[PDB]
Structure 1
Amino acid sequence: FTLIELMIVVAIIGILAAIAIPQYQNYVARSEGASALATINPLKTTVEESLSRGIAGSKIKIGTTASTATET
């Protein structure tokens, strides 16, 4: 081993240790909103169906408790 190789390696290390990094927060901030609406939009179909069929409001809830001929 010599000093030339070691110095060249040290210089190349510092050279590589200079890559810039741009922002990456707005991407996730927008992806979260693009998914929230896509997930909570389809409920309007069920709401309109329940309001136009015959049953009144209030009884319309969320979860997984089966269904019947009165509550949705």
Structure 2
Amino acid sequence: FTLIELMIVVAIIGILAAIAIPQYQNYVARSEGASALASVNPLKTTVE
């Protein structure tokens, strides 16, 4: 009778369907690069 309780649980393991968003790391990368420009931009203005 427990087999059916597991049927959902087999499903539950299954359904997760948005896990590995790697290039999350790559909008993170864009954030890190543009926001790496944020670090320097008033120093343009400072040299000048």
TM-score (norm 2): 0.48
For structure 2, the residue ranges without an aligned partner over 5 or more in a row are none
Question: Structure 2 vs 1, CA of residues 36 and 17 (structure 1 numbering), >3 Å: closer, same or farther?
Answer: closer
- Look up the match of 2:10: 10
Let me know the Cα RMSD of the aligned residues: 3.1
Cα shift at 1:30: 0.5
Q: For the pair shown, which has the larger CA radius of gyration, 1 or 2? A: 1
For structure 1, the residue ranges without an aligned partner over 5 or more in a row are 48-72
Structure 1 segments, 4+ long, off by >2 Å, are: 1-23
Size of the alignment, in residue pairs?
47
TM-score (norm 1): 0.39
Cα shift at 1:15: 4.1
Tell me: higher relative CO, structure 1 or 2? Use CA pairs within 8 A at least 6 residues apart: 1
Identity of counterpart residues, as a percentage? 96
Secondary structure at 2:36 match in 1: helix
Cα shift at 1:25: 2.3
